[PDB]
Structures are given as C-alpha cells and as structure tokens.
Write a protein that binds this ligand. Structure first.
Ligand code: HEM
Ligand SMILES: N[C@@H](CCS)C(=O)O
Length: 184
C-alpha cells in the first residue's frame, strides 16, 4: 500500500513539464521492493492534447523483454498532483486493456526544471498491493543526476544513495512512439 503524501514543487510550471517531450527514469526508489525485484527501464511523455493533460508510459525489462505502453488522461487534484486512469495500448495507441475504475496511478511532481525532475507515484491496479515509487527523471536518457535534482531528493528527506540506477541496464527506448501516443 502507499504511505506518502508527496508535496508538489512550489511554483511548479505545468506548461513546461507537460510540453509533449519525453522524460527518462534514470534512478528510482521503490518503497516496497519485492523479494525479487524486476529491474525495468521506464520513460514517459507528458503533454497537453486538446486541453487535456496526458501522459504516455513505456516500460521495458531488459532481461525478460517484457514491454508495455500506456496512455492516461490526467485529472487535477492540485498544482503538480494528478490522478491518472491508464489504458494499456500497443506502441501505435491501439487499446489492449481499457480504462477501468481502480486502475489508476497518482503522480506528484516534487521538483522540476528544464532538464530534470523528481516525482512520486502510487499505482493502483486491480486487487494488487503496490507501494510508493520515487523517480528521478531527465530529458536525456541515462544522464547523471545533477545537483539540483539531487538536492531536491535530500530536501524531500530521502537518501539518493538508496535509489537504484537504470543507467547500466542496457535500456533502449521508443521515444517516437511515446510522443505520438499523447493524442491516443
Ligand atoms: C524504473 C522505474 C519503474 C519501474 C522499475 C517500474 C516497474 C513496474 C512494474 C514491475 C510493473 C508491473 C506491475 C504489475 O502489474 O504487477 C509496472 C506497471 C506499471 N507502472 Fe511502473 N515502473 C517504473 C516507473 C513508472 C512510472 C514513473 C510510472 C508513472 C508515471 C509507472 C506507472 C505504471 C503503470 C500505470 C503500470 C501498469 C500498466 C498497465 O498494467 O497497463 N511506472 N511498473
Ligand atoms: N509501485 C510499483 C512500482 C512500479 S510502477 C510497484 O509496486 O511495483
């Protein structure tokens, strides 16, 4: 279960974050890691399509090859805090699993600038029991975390040394599909 009420960045710039470009997860902190953690790579595009906030997600497990995409409309709870009903889609946006109540994640932007971000997310999916996840994002895949985002990790009272890096995972990313999914 999730346990954190993450605080959104003061002065969060939504238009800059939701600009249609891609964010890569470079490091993450899972508060309830499984006994045997599945080391996935992940990226997202966040944008506005016809006035609606949207996110497209990409997950890739470089060992199992499991690969899946999602698209969500985001609903606003407050500035920088969203609730997202996801639908699983193929890379082209064709629906594989429809939106359903109880399948959603919350998403809080704790820090963001031009090139980096720190987010919190809580996933709810069926009758699964999932926990909090923090993620460091960068506009450049596998970019080393800079001082601004690392300081934000500290200011959130988290220890960056506890985060798991994706940068040495032999990750590959379908960024063109992520961008085009924003309309789907
Ligand atoms: C490296 C970072 C991440 C890892 C290691 C990771 C891992 C996973 C895993 C193992 C699952 C399968 C859950 C299950 O069904 O048992 C999953 C699903 C999911 N994750 Fe992540 N995740 C990451 C980042 C993110 C981010 C940043 C978001 C939201 C912005 C997100 C949203 C979701 C959603 C919505 C699903 C369910 C998709 C579906 O069933 O259609 N994940 N992730
Ligand atoms: N909260 C998720 C992290 C990946 S989205 C989990 O419990 O595995």
């Amino acid at each position: 279960a999730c346990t954190k009420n993450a605080i959104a960045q003061t002065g969060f710039n939504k238009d800059k974050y939701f600009n249609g470009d891609v964010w890569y997860v470079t490091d993450y902190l899972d508060l309830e890691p499984d006994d045997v953690p599945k080391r996935y790579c992940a990226a997202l595009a966040a944008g506005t399509a016809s006035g609606k906030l949207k996110e497209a997600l990409y997950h890739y497990d470089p060992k199992t090859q499991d690969t899946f995409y999602d698209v969500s409309e985001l609903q606003v709870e407050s500035l920088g805090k969203y609730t997202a009903n996801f639908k699983k889609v193929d890379k082209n946006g064709n629906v594989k699993v429809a939106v359903t109540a109880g399948n959603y994640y919350t998403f809080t932007v704790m820090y963001a600038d031009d090139s980096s971000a720190l987010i919190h997310t809580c996933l709810h999916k069926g009758n699964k029991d999932l926990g909090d996840l923090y993620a460091v994002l960068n506009r450049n895949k596998d970019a080393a975390a800079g001082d601004k985002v690392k300081s934000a990790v500290s200011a959130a009272t988290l220890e960056f040394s506890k985060f798991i890096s994706t940068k040495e995972n032999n990750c590959a990313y379908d960024n063109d599909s992520l961008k085009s999914l924003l309309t789907k």
